[PDB]
Swiss-Prot record, chain A:
Keywords: Antibiotic biosynthesis, Methyltransferase, S-adenosyl-L-methionine, Transferase. GO terms for biological process: antibiotic biosynthetic process; methylation. Belongs to the methyltransferase superfamily. It comes from Streptomyces hygroscopicus. This is Phenylpyruvate C(3)-methyltransferase. Pfam families: Methyltransf_25 (PF13649). The gene is mppJ.
Amino acid sequence: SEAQARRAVADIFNSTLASSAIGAAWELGALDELRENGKLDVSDFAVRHDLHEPAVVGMFTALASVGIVRREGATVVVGPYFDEANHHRSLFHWLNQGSGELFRRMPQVLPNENRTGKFYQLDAGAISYACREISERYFDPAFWAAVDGLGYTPTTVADLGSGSGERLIQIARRFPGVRGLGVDIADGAIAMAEKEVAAKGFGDQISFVRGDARTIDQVSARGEFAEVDLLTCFMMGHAFWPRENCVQTLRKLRAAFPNVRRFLLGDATRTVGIPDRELPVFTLGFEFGHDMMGEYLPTLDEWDGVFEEGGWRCVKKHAIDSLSVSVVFELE
Amino acid sequence: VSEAQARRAVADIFNSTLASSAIGAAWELGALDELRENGKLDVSDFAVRHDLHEPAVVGMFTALASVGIVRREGATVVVGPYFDEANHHRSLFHWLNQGSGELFRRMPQVLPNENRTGKFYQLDAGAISYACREISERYFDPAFWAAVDGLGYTPTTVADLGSGSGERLIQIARRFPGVRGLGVDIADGAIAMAEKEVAAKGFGDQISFVRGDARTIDQVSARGEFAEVDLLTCFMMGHAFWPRENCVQTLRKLRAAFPNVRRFLLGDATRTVGIPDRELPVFTLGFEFGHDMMGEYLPTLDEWDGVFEEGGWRCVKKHAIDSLSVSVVFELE
Ligand SMILES: Nc1ncnc2c1ncn2[C@@H]1O[C@H](CSCC[C@H](N)C(=O)O)[C@@H](O)[C@H]1O
Ligand SMILES: Nc1ncnc2c1ncn2[C@@H]1O[C@H](CSCC[C@H](N)C(=O)O)[C@@H](O)[C@H]1O
Ligand SMILES: CO[C@H](c1ccccc1)[C@@H](O)C(=O)O
Ligand SMILES: CO[C@H](c1ccccc1)[C@@H](O)C(=O)O
Ligand SMILES: O=C(O)[C@H](O)Cc1ccccc1
Ligand SMILES: O=C(O)[C@H](O)Cc1ccccc1
Ligand SMILES: [Ca+2]
Ligand SMILES: [Ca+2]
Ligand SMILES: [Ca+2]
Ligand SMILES: [Ca+2]
Ligand SMILES: [Ca+2]
Ligand SMILES: [Ca+2]
Ligand SMILES: [Ca+2]
Ligand SMILES: [Ca+2]
Ligand SMILES: [Ca+2]
Ligand SMILES: [Ca+2]
Ligand SMILES: [Ca+2]
Ligand SMILES: [Ca+2]
Ligand SMILES: [Ca+2]
Ligand SMILES: [Fe+3]
Ligand SMILES: [Fe+3]
């Protein structure tokens, strides 16, 4: 019926604003205040954060329009979808603040004749902001379980796609005296990581080399790769694909880190068979986004079927809770 | 709610985001019109006919299907339960996403007072103008033509404030042959697009344009071309006259600059009041929230009703619009 359609299309429209507002409300500290108190005063919030109050009210209204919060007079209170939306806030942030410009330019990204050079734009800083919580909230538990199951004590750990350096710092805290080596293709991430590690007191223990993990055989790192006995690779593995490339990169890693015992590999994957109206959070954005960008994304089964050919054996596998289909593999 | 209902609602909000952006893109790329014709289409065929990247096309339609706009059936896409409603409002999705999406995306940077100076947000002007073209025809035409049909006289020269594409002047010239048209628009861009289009349609004799700011019309030196005007029109920009004190003066100045205008047809969307948060209809939230983000005044319907007399005008008829939020056409004289 018409009334139902009217309401469903309106919710579609409003969900757009609520979606953008989830990431924004995280970044600006509102979701944390509402989690800690169950409520807040909108004027007081606007004043304590020095925000444009009409826009703040707009922000909470968007959230309220689809049931994440409820507005009661001067006040905003948690609504029925608050816990679920707050749980997944970093994915909304990734979708909007990080990737929004990609999805927005859909009419300009889809034509074949535009798809050369730098045909889309991501907000790298925003993506990094979101990936920090995505790594801790969804991957940390399986990561540390894999670490707890190593069967040895690492002495030098190399992290591929090292980013901010956080993972290497956490391993260094777990295992006093371990040395770390982070490889990242982006000179900007090398510089940020170097700064963080120095600031946190791990400058003499953790180093960084700029390098492409897909051509790890070309990376010059003072002969340190041969000392590495734990290898880690989180949220970037899909970059090794398509399959023939992935097989060669896996062999190359096997030869460049010949004293690696365990290789812990964590990523999100492309799903198969999920009915359109049942797609869970993230899955559609991650896949559609990689398809817009022209980047390969393997399924779980494709990973499972590549290891042996690539020179590794999967000895344990961990399911991630609610990040589309995501896994951590323990390879040796 | 159970945890499962919450899971579903939040996944829906997430997927809505992609569907929303896809409605606009599907319009712009020709998909929604192909589906209207036949009720179905072949995804690969579409992709090949439009030379588009097929995996991305497949995601576009999957996003649409994710919330019930379309339904995917093997290789085909078929219209879904919300197709007609979404298609009806497609220009509003485009406006929200392809036009205004960068505004909303930058919420965390736009809200802090310290950032709100200079150029602190970015709209896609060309996308907005593409959507506004259809918004104008789809939402404002019935009431605009209703007002035109009760003028009680035959205009001889019409001036349109915020003329844009020139399309309203051209439509008036097709209904009133040998009416003359004058458009006033602040953008050099709009002026040149409109001149071109007028020429192309064979009207460059009847219709002319002048760059000018309708907020300060006394500073536009249009040559008592303004004195021959007996019909004044202004659609989709009136809220630029506000705040109230500026609105009063702008109104008086238009009255003076167009002393021979009989009727002044003023159409715009307005800020609503009192709508419950879970009942907000399409457009309302994005129009209002966006203007509050840009720091741009938006009056309510009551504010407009209370300003005309001070501004030198009498409101003789008002038309409600279906429903672009709360929109109206006022007939002033
Ligand atoms: N082919 C490649 N080789 C090395 N680093 C890469 C790469 N592809 C992407 N990266 C880096 O991988 C990072 C992905 S962000 C995820 C970071 C980190 N592994 C974590 O769990 O938090 C970015 O710094 C990017 O620069
Ligand atoms: N203060 C002002 N003076 C003159 N033109 C203005 C203006 N503020 C906005 N505009 C113009 O008004 C147009 C808004 S789009 C509306 C176009 C037209 N009235 C229609 O119904 O389709 C743009 O071309 C913009 O350049
Ligand atoms: C930058 O990290 C992001 C991510 C998020 C979840 C899982 C995997 C990767 C994503 O932009 C990517 O690298 O594909
Ligand atoms: C540019 O057109 C847009 C519009 C849409 C509906 C009604 C009025 C105006 C709007 O973004 C504007 O305020 O100028
Ligand atoms: O094939 C798989 O499932 C995984 O890649 C790893 C695995 C295989 C066998 C037993 C445990 C784990
Ligand atoms: O005050 C109002 O409602 C309108 O501005 C115009 C109107 C007034 C009186 C009779 C009809 C129309
Ligand atoms: Ca309170
Ligand atoms: Ca509610
Ligand atoms: Ca675009
Ligand atoms: Ca779900
Ligand atoms: Ca398997
Ligand atoms: Ca077909
Ligand atoms: Ca359906
Ligand atoms: Ca299918
Ligand atoms: Ca931002
Ligand atoms: Ca800007
Ligand atoms: Ca823009
Ligand atoms: Ca001027
Ligand atoms: Ca409605
Ligand atoms: Fe990726
Ligand atoms: Fe406006």
